[PDB]
Tab-separated table of C-alpha atoms in Angstrom:
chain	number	residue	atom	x	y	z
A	1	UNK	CA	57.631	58.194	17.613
A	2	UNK	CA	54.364	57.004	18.981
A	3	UNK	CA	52.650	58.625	21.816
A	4	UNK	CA	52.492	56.506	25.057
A	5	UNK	CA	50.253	56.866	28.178
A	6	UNK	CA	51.668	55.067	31.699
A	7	UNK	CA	49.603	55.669	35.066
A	8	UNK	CA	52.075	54.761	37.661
A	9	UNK	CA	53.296	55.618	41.330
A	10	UNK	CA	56.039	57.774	41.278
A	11	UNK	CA	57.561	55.905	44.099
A	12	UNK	CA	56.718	52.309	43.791
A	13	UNK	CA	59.311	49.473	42.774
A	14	UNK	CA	56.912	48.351	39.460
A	15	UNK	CA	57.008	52.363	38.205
A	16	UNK	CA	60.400	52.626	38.495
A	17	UNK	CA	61.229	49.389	36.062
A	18	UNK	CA	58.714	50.050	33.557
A	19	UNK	CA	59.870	53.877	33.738
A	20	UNK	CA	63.708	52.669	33.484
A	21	UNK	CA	62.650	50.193	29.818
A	22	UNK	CA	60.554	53.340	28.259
A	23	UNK	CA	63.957	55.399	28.816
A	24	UNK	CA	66.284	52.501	27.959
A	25	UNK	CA	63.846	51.968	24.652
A	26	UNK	CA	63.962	55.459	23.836
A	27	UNK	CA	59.873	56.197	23.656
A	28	UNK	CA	58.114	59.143	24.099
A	29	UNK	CA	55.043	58.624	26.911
A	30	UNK	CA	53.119	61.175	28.730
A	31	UNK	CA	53.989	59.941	32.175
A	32	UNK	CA	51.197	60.784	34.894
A	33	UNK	CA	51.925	60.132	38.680
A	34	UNK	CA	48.625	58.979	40.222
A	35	UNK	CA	49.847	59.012	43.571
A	36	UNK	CA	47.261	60.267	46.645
A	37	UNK	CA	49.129	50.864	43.117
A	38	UNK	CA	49.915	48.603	39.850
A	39	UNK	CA	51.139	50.742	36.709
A	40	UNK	CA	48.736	51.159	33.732
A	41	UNK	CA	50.499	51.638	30.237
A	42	UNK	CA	47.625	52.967	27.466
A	43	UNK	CA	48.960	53.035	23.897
A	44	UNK	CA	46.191	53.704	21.662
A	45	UNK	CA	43.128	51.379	22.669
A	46	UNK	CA	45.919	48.708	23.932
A	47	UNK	CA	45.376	48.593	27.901
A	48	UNK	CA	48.349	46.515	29.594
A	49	UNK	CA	48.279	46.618	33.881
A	50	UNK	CA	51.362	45.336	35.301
A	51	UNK	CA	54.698	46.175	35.112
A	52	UNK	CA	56.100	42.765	34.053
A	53	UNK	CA	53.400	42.360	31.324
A	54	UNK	CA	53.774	46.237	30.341
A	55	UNK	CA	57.198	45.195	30.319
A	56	UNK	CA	56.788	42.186	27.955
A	57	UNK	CA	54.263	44.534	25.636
A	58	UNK	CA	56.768	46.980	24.843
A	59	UNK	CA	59.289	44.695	23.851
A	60	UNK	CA	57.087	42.486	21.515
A	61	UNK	CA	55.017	46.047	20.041
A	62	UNK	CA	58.002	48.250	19.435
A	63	UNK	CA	60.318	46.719	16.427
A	64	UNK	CA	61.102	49.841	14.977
A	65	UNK	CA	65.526	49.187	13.810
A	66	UNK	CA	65.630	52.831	15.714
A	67	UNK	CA	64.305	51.463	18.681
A	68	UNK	CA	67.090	49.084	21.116
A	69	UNK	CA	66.210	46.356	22.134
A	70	UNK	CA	66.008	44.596	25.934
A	71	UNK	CA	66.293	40.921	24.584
A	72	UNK	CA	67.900	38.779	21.954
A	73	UNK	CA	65.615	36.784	19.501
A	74	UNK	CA	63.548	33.997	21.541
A	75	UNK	CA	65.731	31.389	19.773
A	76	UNK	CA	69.152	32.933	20.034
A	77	UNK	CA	72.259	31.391	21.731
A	78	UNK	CA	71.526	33.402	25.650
A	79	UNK	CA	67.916	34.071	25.475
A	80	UNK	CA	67.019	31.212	27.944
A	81	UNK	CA	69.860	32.752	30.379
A	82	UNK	CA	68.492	36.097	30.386
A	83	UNK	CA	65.178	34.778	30.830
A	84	UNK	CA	66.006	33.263	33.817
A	85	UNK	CA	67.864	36.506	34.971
A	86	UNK	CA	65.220	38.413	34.967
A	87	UNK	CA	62.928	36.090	36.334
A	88	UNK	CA	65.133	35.282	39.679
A	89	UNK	CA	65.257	38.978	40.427
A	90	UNK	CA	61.640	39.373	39.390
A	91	UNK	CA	60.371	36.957	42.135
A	92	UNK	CA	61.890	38.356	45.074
A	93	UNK	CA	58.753	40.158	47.361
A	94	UNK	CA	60.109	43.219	47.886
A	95	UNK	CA	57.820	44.984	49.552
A	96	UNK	CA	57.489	41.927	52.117
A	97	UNK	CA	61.176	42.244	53.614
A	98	UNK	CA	59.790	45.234	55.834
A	99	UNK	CA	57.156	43.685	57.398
A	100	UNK	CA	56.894	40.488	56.210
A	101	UNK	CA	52.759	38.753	54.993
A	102	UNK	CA	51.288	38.968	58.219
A	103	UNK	CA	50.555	42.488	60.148
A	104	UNK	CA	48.086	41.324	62.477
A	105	UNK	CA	50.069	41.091	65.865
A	106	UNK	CA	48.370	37.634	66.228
A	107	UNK	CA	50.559	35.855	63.750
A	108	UNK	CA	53.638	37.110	64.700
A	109	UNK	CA	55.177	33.728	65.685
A	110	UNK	CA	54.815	32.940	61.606
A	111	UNK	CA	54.989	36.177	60.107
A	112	UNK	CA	59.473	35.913	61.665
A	113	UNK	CA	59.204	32.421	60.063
A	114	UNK	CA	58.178	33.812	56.938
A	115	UNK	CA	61.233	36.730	57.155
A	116	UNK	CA	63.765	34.322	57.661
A	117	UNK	CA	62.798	32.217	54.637
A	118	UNK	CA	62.896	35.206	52.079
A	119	UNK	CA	65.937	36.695	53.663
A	120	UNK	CA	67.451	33.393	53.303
A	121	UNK	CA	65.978	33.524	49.224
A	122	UNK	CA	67.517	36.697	48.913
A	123	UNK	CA	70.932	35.577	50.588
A	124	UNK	CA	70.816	32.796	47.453
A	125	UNK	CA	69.775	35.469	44.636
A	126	UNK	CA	72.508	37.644	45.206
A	127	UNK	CA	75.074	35.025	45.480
A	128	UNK	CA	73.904	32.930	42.584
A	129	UNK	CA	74.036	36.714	40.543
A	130	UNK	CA	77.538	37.693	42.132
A	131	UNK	CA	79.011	34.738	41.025
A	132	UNK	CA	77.637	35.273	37.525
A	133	UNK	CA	79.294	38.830	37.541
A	134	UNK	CA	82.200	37.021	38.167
A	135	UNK	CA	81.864	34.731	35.316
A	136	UNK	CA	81.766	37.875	33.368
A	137	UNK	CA	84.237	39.613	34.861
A	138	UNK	CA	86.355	36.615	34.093
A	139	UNK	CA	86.028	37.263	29.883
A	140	UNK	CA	86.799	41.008	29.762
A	141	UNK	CA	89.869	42.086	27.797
A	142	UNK	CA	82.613	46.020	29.704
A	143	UNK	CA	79.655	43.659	29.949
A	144	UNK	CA	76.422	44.176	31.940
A	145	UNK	CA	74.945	40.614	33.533
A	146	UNK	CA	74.438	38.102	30.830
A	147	UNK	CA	76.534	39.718	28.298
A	148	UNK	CA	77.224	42.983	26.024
A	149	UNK	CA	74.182	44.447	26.023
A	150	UNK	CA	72.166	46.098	28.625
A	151	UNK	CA	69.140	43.793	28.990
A	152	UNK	CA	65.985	43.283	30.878
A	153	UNK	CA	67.656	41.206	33.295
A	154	UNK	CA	69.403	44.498	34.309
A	155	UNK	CA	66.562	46.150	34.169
A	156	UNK	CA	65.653	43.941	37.155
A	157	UNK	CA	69.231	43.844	38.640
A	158	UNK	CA	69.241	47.873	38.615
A	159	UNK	CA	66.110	48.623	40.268
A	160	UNK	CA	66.410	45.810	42.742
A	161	UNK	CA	69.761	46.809	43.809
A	162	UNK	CA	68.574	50.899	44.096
A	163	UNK	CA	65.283	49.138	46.122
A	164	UNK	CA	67.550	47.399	48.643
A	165	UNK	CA	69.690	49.972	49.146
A	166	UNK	CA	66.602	52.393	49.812
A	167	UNK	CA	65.800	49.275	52.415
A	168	UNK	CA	69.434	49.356	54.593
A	169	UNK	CA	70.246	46.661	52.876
A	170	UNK	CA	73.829	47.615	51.044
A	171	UNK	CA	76.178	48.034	53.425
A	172	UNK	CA	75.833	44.574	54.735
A	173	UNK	CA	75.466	42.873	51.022
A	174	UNK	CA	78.288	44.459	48.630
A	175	UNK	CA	80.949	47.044	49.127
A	176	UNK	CA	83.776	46.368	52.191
A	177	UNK	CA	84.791	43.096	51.321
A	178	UNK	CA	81.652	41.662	50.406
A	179	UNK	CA	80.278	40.624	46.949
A	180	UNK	CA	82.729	43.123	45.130
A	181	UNK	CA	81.507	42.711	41.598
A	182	UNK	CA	77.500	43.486	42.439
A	183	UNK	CA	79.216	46.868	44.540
A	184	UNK	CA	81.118	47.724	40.873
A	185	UNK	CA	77.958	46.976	38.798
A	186	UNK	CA	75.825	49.328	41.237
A	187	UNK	CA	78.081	52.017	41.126
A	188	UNK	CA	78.237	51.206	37.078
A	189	UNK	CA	74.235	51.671	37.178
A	190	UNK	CA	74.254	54.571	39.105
A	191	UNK	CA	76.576	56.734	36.250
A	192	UNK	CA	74.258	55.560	33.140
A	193	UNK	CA	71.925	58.231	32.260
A	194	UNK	CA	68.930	56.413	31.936
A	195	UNK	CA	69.081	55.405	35.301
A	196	UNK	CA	70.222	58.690	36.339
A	197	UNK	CA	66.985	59.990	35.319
A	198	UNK	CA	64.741	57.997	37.208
């Protein structure tokens, strides 16, 4: 029970991961939506911008045996498969898909080339992580993406599925035929509370 301050825009993709591990990690913070774009966690005279590094701060600061944790021990058996979970998801651009790095009408001829090769990324992502529900779906007499526990790699998994739904971009990527166990996980997402909340 410490008291936590986060600056963050209600609506933005960072807000709504960091928001999602404060609920998931049981905290209290004083939540303050400075919308009129990179969250701002304050706790004490600690000042972390970021939402990956506000991320990695309250997983490293908050040891408490009450609090759950988002990661196994940096030498357990899967830490270096989460890792790289969460860090796939975490380096799609996803507020490029709309309209892509260049605006300027001028660069149009590049800015399509530049669509194409992150749709194509994010064609790869979601296969690569469908087959790895799979793999789990595979060993179940439930488990979330890299095993029992809910971890930060669903963090990332959650949010970016809710993002690309927001974006038009479900109903051609899962459900209907298509990438059945990422359609079951998001509908799993959807009924947890935590999630529910934000």
């Amino acid at each position: 029970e410490v008291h936590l301050i986060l600056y963050h825009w209600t609506h933005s993709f960072s807000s709504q991961k960091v928001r999602l591990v404060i609920a998931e990690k049981a905290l209290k913070c004083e939540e303050h939506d400075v919308s009129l774009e990179v969250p701002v966690l304050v706790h004490g005279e600690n000042i972390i911008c970021e939402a990956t590094q506000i991320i990695d701060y309250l997983e490293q600061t908050f040891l408490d045996e009450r609090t759950p944790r988002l990661m196994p021990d940096e030498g357990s058996m899967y830490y270096p498969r989460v890792q790289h979970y969460r860090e796939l998801l975490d380096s799609l651009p996803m507020d490029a898909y709309t309209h892509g790095c260049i605006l300027h009408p001028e660069g149009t001829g590049d800015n399509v080339k530049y669509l194409k090769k992150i749709l194509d990324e994010l064609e790869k992502v979601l296969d690569q992580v469908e087959t790895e529900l799979q793999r789990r779906n595979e060993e179940t007499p439930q488990p979330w993406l890299c095993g029992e526990s809910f971890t930060l790699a669903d963090v990332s998994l959650a949010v970016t599925l809710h993002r690309l739904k927001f974006l038009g971009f479900a109903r051609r990527n899962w459900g209907h035929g298509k990438r059945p166990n990422l359609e079951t996980y998001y509908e799993r997402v959807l009924k947890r509370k935590t999630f529910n909340k934000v």
